[PDB]
Amino acid sequence: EFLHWLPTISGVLRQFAEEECYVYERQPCWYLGKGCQARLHINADGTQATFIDDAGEQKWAVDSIADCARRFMAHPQVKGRRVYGQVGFNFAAHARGIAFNAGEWPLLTLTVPREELIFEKGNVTVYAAPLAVDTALNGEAYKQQVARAVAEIRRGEYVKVIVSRAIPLPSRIDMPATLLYGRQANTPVRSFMFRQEGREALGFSPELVMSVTGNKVVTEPLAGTRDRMGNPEHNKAKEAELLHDSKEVLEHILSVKEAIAELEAVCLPGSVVVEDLMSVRQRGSVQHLGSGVSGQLAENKDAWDAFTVLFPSITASGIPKNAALNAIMQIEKTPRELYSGAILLLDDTRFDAALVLRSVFQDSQRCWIQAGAGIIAQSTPERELTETREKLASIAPYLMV
Q: Of 20, 207, 220, 337, which is the active-site residue?
A: 207
What's the min distance (Å) between Cβ of 242 and Fe ion? 10
Nearby residues of 44 by Cβ (< 8 Å), 6 or more positions away: 88, 90, 102, 103, 104, 105, 106, 107
Contact between 188 and 358 (Cβ < 8 Å): yes
- Closest residue to Fe ion: CB criterion: 374
Contact flags string 193-232 toward Fe ion, x per CB under 5 A: --------------------------------x-------
Q: Using the rule CB under 5 A, is 290 a contact of Fe ion?
A: no
Q: Which of 343, 338, 340 is nearest to 357 (CA)?
A: 340
Q: Using the rule CB under 5 A, is 182 a contact of Fe ion?
A: no
What's the min distance (Å) between Cβ of 247 and Fe ion? 8
Q: Is 264 annotated as a binding residue?
A: no
Q: Using the rule CB under 5 A, is 113 a contact of Fe ion?
A: no
Contact between 41 and 57 (Cβ < 8 Å): no
Contact flags string 307-326 toward Fe ion, x per CB under 5 A: --------------------
Q: Which of 355, 208, 357, 353 is nearest to 286 (CA)?
A: 357
Q: How far is CA 213 from CA 288, 370, 374, in A?
A: 25, 31, 30
Enclosing H/E stretch for 96: helix 91-96
What's the min distance (Å) between Cβ of 210 and Fe ion? 22
- 124-134 b/e (C-beta count within 10 Å ≥ 16 → b): beeeeebbebe
Q: Which of 387, 358, 383 is nearest to 370 (CA)?
A: 358
Candidates 87-95, 210-218, 274-282, 366-374 — which segment interacts with Fe ion by CB under 5 A?
Answer: 366-374
Enclosing H/E stretch for 237: helix 232-243
Residues 295, 81: Cα–Cα separation, whole Å: 26
Residue-wise DSSP of 124-156 = -EEE--BPP--TTTTHHHHHHHHHHHHHHHHTT
Of 78 and 222, which CB lies nearer to Fe ion in the complex structure?
222
Q: Using the rule CB under 5 A, is 381 a contact of Fe ion?
A: no
Of 215 and 378, which CB lies nearer to Fe ion in the complex structure?
378
What is the CA 54 to chain-centroid distance, rounded?
30
Residues 242, 251: Cα–Cα separation, whole Å: 11
Q: Using the rule CB under 5 A, is 374 a contact of Fe ion?
A: yes
What's the min distance (Å) between Cβ of 224 and Fe ion? 6
Active site annotation includes 207: yes
Of 88 and 374, which CB lies nearer to Fe ion in the complex structure?
374
Q: Using the rule CB under 5 A, is 372 a contact of Fe ion?
A: no
Of 199 and 336, which CB lies nearer to Fe ion in the complex structure?
336
Q: Is 262 annotated as a binding residue?
A: no
Of 113 and 374, which CB lies nearer to Fe ion in the complex structure?
374
Contact flags string 134-153 toward Fe ion, x per CB under 5 A: --------------------
Residue-wise DSSP of 152-213 = HHHTTS-SEEEEEEEEE-SS---HHHHHHHHHHT---SEEEEEEETTEEEEEEE-SEEEEEE
What's the min distance (Å) between Cβ of 374 and Fe ion? 4
What's the min distance (Å) between Cβ of 223 and Fe ion? 7
Candidates 18-26, 96-104, 340-348, 372-380 — which segment interacts with Fe ion by CB under 5 A?
Answer: 372-380
Query: Would you call the peptide bond into 88 cis, given omega within 30 degrees of 0 as the criterion?
Result: no
Of 374 and 381, which CB lies nearer to Fe ion in the complex structure?
374
Residues 230, 194: Cα–Cα separation, whole Å: 32
Q: Using the rule CB under 5 A, is 85 a contact of Fe ion?
A: no
Size of the site for Fe ion (CB under 5 A): 2
What's the min distance (Å) between Cβ of 387 and Fe ion? 6
Please state the residue numbers annotated as binding site: 251, 387
Catalytic residue numbers read 207
Please report, as ranges, the residues that interact with Fe ion according to CB under 5 A: 225, 374
Please state the residue numbers annotated as binding site for Fe(2+): 251, 387
